[PDB]
RNA sequence: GGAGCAAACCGGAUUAGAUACCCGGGUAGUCCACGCCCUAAACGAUGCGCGCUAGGUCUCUGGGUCUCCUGGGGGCCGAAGCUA
RNA sequence: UAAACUCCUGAACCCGGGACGAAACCCCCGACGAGGGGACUGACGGUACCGGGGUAAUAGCGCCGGCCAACUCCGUGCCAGCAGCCGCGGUAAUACGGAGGGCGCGAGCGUUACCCGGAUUCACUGGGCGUAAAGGGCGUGUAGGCGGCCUGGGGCGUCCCAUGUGA
C-alpha cells in the first residue's frame, strides 16, 4: 500500500493462537481420569489406542493419551499431563506423564526410559 | 582441471503406457577456487551419466569472478524468476555464510569471506542460476574506471 | 523557556478566551513521511482583543481555568479565515459519519 | 569433567591422527597406524558422501577433541575471539593455545595434555612464581611458566624435562630446561601451529 | 500532471539507454540540470545540453555506453546499470552526513541536495554536509 | 396492461424411479407508470491520472500540401522489457 | 588401549598454623579546630588461605528413516506401539521393543510450556492483487494526501557548529 495508506492504517501484528490450554500456558496440569477407554485412530492408520478421559484444577475436562507399552490406569486415577497432540486421534491434545501419581512408569524399558518414566535397573548396573 | 561439486540430483519422470519412465538430472559446480566457476545442470537416464554430462556443461560455462582477498568487490542483489540471492561482502574470518547452493558456488570460486540470503523461491536450481548471474554482474573500481571514461 | 506556540484562533465565544488551533509537523516514527497533526488550545484573553481568523502566538502560563494554561503573546497576522474554514468544515463532515 | 574414555579411538574416527597420548599416540600406532577407519561394526565399509553440517560437525569435533576441552568452554572461547578484534579464526586457535594446561604441554613439562592436565590440576605448575591449579587459565604473554620446586624431584617431570634435552619449542614459547621454567613470550599466529584443522569450517559451524 | 520531475528525468535516463539510444530529451529544470552536472562529471552520461523543443526548454542529454560484446547478444555493456528515485513526493528522505550511504562500496553515487548545493555523497561528506538524499546511481 | 413466452402448478411421454431433460396446457412474471430493492462470472476476472520505451498490419472517425503525412478510438502480430 | 596388569600423580579424608574485612566513635597532648598519641571492637569462622600427611577414587541422559551427526541382529506382524512435520508398523521394519555397535552433550541430559528467530508469512528496511488470497459495480465529489517552470523575501521542515541533558 501507499506511504500514506501505511501512515493512516499501518500493517496488523499477528496473534498466536494456543494449542493448548493446560489452562494458562503453565507447563502441567494435574487432573483425575474419569473413563480410560481405547479408541481407533483414523486416516490410514489402524490400532486400539489408549486413552484418558480427564478432569482437570484448570477447571476443563480433556482427553489426553497415554504413551508406553502398556498401563495401570483405572477409573479414579490421578494423572499429570502434559500436551502434545496425538494426531491419529482427534481430540487428544495432552499425553499423560508417566511416573507421577497413580501412572506407574512403564516396566520393562530399557532404552528412552525417561521419557515412560522408568528408573534405571540394576543388573549389569 | 578444476575440482566439481555436485548440488543437486533428482529423479524426474514422464508418463507413458503402461507406467513411469525416469529420467535423472544433476546440477554441479565446477571451480578452481580462483575466480573460475561454471553451473551445470545435465539430465539423462543414469544418474552416472548425468553427472558427467553436468560437469561438461559447467565447463562450457564459466566466469570472471573478481576475487579481493576471498571476497567480492560490492553487494548485489539478483532476481532469477522468483528467485533472489543476496551477495555481501565480508572482512576476513566471517566465513561463507550461506545456504547449500549458493555456497558450494561460492566456495569454488575461491570465496572465503561472504553474507548472502536467500529471497524468494528458494528453489535450487534458480537460486544457482542467480549466483552465477551475480558472479557474473560484479564489476571492481578498475573496470567502473574503465567505463566512465570518454 | 515558556514554551511559545503559533496558530489560528477558531473560536471567541467564550469570554476572555480564544481557542487556537495549532499544526505541528514531523516524520512519522517508522514510514518517515512528514505528517502533520494539530491541537486546540485554549487561550487566555483579557481584554477580548482577538477575534476569529487571527494568528497568534500562544504562550506556557500559569493556570487560568481547567485546561486554560496559555495566554495569548501577540498578533502575528490577521485575516487568515480560509484556516477557519478548514477546521469547520472538518467539523461539520463529523455529522456525516454517525447512524 | 573433562572427556575421560578411550582416545587413540578418535586418533580414529576423525581421519587424522590426533595426538590425545602423547608417547604411544606417535610410535607403530596412535592404534591409527594399524586400523586407519572409523570405530564400531561399520568402520570398514564404503563411507558416505558426508553433509556439509557432517563436514563442519566433524573439523569441529577433531579442533575441541585436541584440546580435550568440553562443548560449552569451546564456545564460549568461540563466542569470545568473535568479539574481539581481528581474524577471528586465529583469535580463536590464539586463545585455546594460552590455555595453561596446553601451554604446559607445549613447553614439554608434560608429554600430553591430558597428562599437563593432571599435572596443572595437582600443585605441579606454577606462573610467575604463584601457584596455579587451573587448566583453563589464560597464560598471557610475559607470563614464565615454571615446574613447582617441590615436585621436582618426580620421575615423571625428570623424564620429560630430560627428554626435552635436544627438542625445540615452538617460536611463541622459550625454554631454560635446566631450570624447569618456560615463558610465553607472544600468542601464536595460525601459521606458527601446524593443526590438521582448517578453522574456516569451524566458523562456519558456529554460524547456524 | 508529473509529480515526480527528477523521477521523470531519471526514468526518461533508465529507459532511452536500455534502448541503447543516443539521446534523451527531458524537460528543462535548473534542479535538472545540477544533477546532469553531476552525473556527466562522473562519467555517468556523455554530457547535456539546453535545446528548445516545438520553443521550450529541454535538456538533450548524451548517453554513454560500453563497447560491443562478444558471443550471442553484443549490445554493450551499460554505464548507467542502475538509476533510482530515493526521497520522493510521497516520502521525503533526509540525511545527517554520519547516515550518507556508500552505494555499492563507492562503485556507485548518490547525488544528495544540500544547503551548500546539489553534491555527490563524497563532495558532500567531506564538505561536512548532509540533506535530502535524491537518488543513487551506479 | 397482458399478444407471445413462461418459474410454480395441471397433464402426456421417457425411466428401474423421473419430483428432470422431451411434448401439451399454464399463473406470478416478462410490458407501462410511480415508488422500493442494490445484487452479479456488475469481467478485461486488470483502480484512476501523468510521463517514458521499436515497429508492422487491419479497422472506425477528424484535419493536411489528401502517393503519403498528422490527431482520436477499436483489433491482430510483435522491439526492448516483464511474467510462475 | 578399552579392560586385566606396570609404574606415576594424589579429589575425598586426617594433622598443624590461621586471616583481610576494623578504624573510627571514645580517651590523652594540642584548642573540644588541624595534627599527633592511646584503648576497645568479628556474626561469617576455626571459614577463606598457607604448610605436613594422604586413598584410583561417580556417570549419566537423549538420539541413530529424511530434515540430522549416528546401522546392524533378533523380537514383532496395520498388533503392540512410534509420531515435531513428512510418515513408520499388513513376516526380512536402519522409523515399533530389545540387544550389540555408533552419534551428541555431560552433573547433567531430555520433556512440556512461553517469547523472539527462521517468517521478505503485516514486507519502513522488505510483499503483493489478469488466471494463485486480493481492484471497491460505476460515478460525483468533502476532509485528507500529493503538485509544472522562473525570481525574490521568511527559515517551519531539512542540514551544520557549539552547549545543557541523557543518574
Ligand atoms: N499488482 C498489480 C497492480 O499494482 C498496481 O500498482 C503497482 C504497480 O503499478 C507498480 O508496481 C511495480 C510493478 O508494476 C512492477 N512489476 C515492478 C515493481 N517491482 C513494482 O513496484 C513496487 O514494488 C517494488 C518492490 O517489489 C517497490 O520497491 C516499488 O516502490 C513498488 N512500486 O506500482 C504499484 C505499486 O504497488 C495497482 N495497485 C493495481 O493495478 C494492481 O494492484
Ligand atoms: C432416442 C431413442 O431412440 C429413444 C428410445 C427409447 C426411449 C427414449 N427416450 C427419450 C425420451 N423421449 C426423452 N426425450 C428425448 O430424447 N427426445 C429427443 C425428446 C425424454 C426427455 O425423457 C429422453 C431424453 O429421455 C430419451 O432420449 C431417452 O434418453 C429415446
Ligand atoms: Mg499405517
Ligand atoms: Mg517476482
Ligand atoms: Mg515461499
Ligand atoms: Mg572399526
Ligand atoms: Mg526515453
Ligand atoms: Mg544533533
Ligand atoms: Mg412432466
Ligand atoms: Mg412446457
Ligand atoms: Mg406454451
Ligand atoms: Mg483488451
Ligand atoms: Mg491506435
Ligand atoms: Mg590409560
Ligand atoms: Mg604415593
Ligand atoms: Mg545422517
Ligand atoms: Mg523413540
Ligand atoms: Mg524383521
Ligand atoms: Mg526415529
Ligand atoms: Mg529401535
Ligand atoms: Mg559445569
Ligand atoms: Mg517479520
Ligand atoms: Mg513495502
Ligand atoms: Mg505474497
Ligand atoms: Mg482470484
Ligand atoms: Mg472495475
Ligand atoms: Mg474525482
Ligand atoms: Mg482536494
Ligand atoms: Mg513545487
Ligand atoms: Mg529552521
Not at chain 2, 567480492?72 to 547452493?101: C, D, R
Not at chain 4, 620429560?160 to 618456560?182: F, H, I, Q, T, Y
Request: glycine fraction near 8%; hydrophobic fraction near 35%; charge should be positive.
Amino acid at each position: 500500500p501507499t506511504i500514506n495508506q501505511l501512515v493512516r492504517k499501518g500493517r496488523e501484528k499477528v496473534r498466536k493462537k494456543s494449542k493448548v490450554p493446560a489452562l494458562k500456558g503453565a507447563p502441567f496440569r494435574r487432573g483425575v481420569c474419569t473413563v480410560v477407554r481405547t479408541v481407533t485412530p483414523k486416516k490410514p492408520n489402524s490400532a486400539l489406542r489408549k486413552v484418558a478421559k480427564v478432569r482437570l484444577t484448570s477447571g476443563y475436562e480433556v482427553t489426553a493419551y497415554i504413551p508406553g507399552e502398556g498401563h495401570n490406569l483405572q477409573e479414579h486415577s490421578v494423572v499429570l499431563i502434559r500436551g502434545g497432540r496425538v494426531k491419529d486421534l482427534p481430540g487428544v491434545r495432552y499425553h499423560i506423564v508417566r511416573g507421577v501419581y497413580d501412572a506407574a512408569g512403564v516396566k520393562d524399558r530399557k532404552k528412552s526410559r525417561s521419557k515412560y518414566g522408568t528408573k534405571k535397573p540394576k543388573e549389569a548396573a | 582441471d578444476f575440482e566439481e561439486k555436485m548440488i543437486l540430483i533428482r529423479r524426474t519422470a514422464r508418463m507413458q503406457a503402461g507406467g513411469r519412465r525416469f529420467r535423472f538430472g544433476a546440477l554441479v559446480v565446477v571451480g578452481d577456487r580462483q575466480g573460475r566457476v561454471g553451473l551445470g545442470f545435465g539430465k539423462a537416464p543414469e544418474v552416472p551419466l548425468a553427472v558427467q554430462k553436468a560437469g561438461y556443461y559447467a565447463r562450457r560455462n564459466m566466469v570472471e569472478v573478481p576475487l579481493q582477498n576471498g571476497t567480492i568487490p560490492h553487494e548485489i542483489e539478483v532476481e532469477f524468476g522468483a528467485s533472489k540471492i543476496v551477495l555481501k561482502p565480508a572482512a576476513p574470518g566471517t566465513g561463507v555464510i550461506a545456504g547449500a547452493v549458493p555456497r558450494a558456488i561460492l566456495e569454488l570460486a575461491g570465496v572465503t569471506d561472504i553474507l548472502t540470503k536467500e529471497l524468494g523461491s528458494r528453489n535450487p536450481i534458480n537460486i544457482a542460476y542467480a549466483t552465477m548471474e551475480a558472479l557474473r554482474q560484479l564489476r571492481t573500481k578498475a573496470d567502473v574506471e574503465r567505463l566512465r571514461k570518454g | 523557556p515558556k514554551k511559545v506556540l503559533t496558530g489560528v484562533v477558531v473560536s471567541d465565544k467564550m469570554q476572555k478566551t480564544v481557542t487556537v488551533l495549532v499544526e505541528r509537523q514531523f516524520p512519522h516514527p517508522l514510514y518517515g513521511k512528514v505528517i502533520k497533526r494539530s491541537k486546540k488550545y485554549l487561550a487566555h484573553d483579557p481584554e477580548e482583543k482577538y477575534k476569529l481568523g487571527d494568528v497568534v502566538e500562544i504562550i506556557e502560563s500559569r493556570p487560568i481555568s481547567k485546561r486554560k494554561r496559555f495566554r495569548v503573546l501577540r498578533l502575528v497576522e490577521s485575516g487568515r479565515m480560509d484556516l477557519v474554514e478548514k477546521y469547520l468544515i472538518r467539523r461539520q463532515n463529523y455529522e456525516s459519519l454517525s447512524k | 569433567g573433562r572427556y575421560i574414555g578411550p582416545v587413540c579411538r578418535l586418533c580414529r574416527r576423525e581421519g587424522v591422527k590426533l595426538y590425545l597420548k602423547g608417547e604411544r599416540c606417535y610410535s607403530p600406532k596412535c592404534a591409527m597406524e594399524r586400523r586407519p577407519y572409523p570405530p564400531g561394526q561399520h568402520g570398514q565399509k564404503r563411507a558416505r558422501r558426508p553433509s556439509d553440517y557432517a563436514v563442519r560437525l566433524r573439523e569441529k569435533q577433531k579442533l575441541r577433541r585436541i584440546y580435550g576441552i568440553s562443548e560449552r568452554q569451546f564456545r564460549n572461547l568461540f563466542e569470545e575471539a568473535s568479539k574481539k578484534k581481528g581474524v577471528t579464526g586465529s583469535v580463536f586457535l590464539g586463545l585455546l593455545e594460552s590455555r595453561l594446561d596446553n601451554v604446559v604441554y607445549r613447553l614439554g613439562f608434560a608429554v600430553s595434555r591430558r597428562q599437563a592436565r593432571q599435572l596443572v590440576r595437582h600443585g605441579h605448575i606454577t606462573v610467575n612464581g604463584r601457584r596455579v591449579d587451573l587448566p583453563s587459565y589464560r597464560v598471557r604473554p610475559g607470563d614464565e611458566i615454571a615446574v613447582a620446586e617441590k615436585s621436582r624431584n618426580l620421575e615423571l617431570i625428570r623424564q620429560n624435562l630430560e627428554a626435552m634435552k635436544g627438542r625445540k619449542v615452538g617460536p611463541w614459547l622459550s625454554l631454560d630446561v635446566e631450570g624447569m621454567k618456560g615463558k610465553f613470550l607472544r600468542l601464536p599466529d595460525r601459521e606458527d601451529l601446524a593443526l590438521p584443522v582448517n578453522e574456516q569450517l569451524v566458523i562456519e559451524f558456529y554460524s547456524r | 500532471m508529473l509529480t515526480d520531475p527528477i523521477a521523470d528525468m531519471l526514468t526518461r535516463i533508465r529507459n532511452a539507454t536500455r534502448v541503447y539510444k543516443e539521446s534523451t530529451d527531458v524537460p528543462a529544470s535548473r534542479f535538472k540540470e545540477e544533477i546532469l552536472r553531476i552525473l556527466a562529471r562522473e562519467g555517468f552520461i556523455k554530457g547535456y545540453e539546453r535545446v528548445d523543443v516545438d520553443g521550450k526548454p529541454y535538456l538533450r542529454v548524451y548517453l554513454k555506453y560500453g563497447p560491443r560484446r562478444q558471443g550471442p547478444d553484443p549490445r554493450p555493456e551499460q554505464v548507467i546499470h542502475h538509476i533510482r528515485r530515493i526521497s520522493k513526493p510521497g516520502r521525503r528522505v533526509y540525511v545527517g552526513v554520519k547516515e550518507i550511504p556508500r552505494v555499492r562500496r563507492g562503485l556507485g553515487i548518490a547525488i544528495l541536495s544540500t544547503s551548500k548545493g546539489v553534491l555527490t555523497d563524497r563532495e558532500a561528506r567531506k564538505l561536512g554536509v548532509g540533506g535530502e538524499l535524491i537518488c543513487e546511481v551506479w
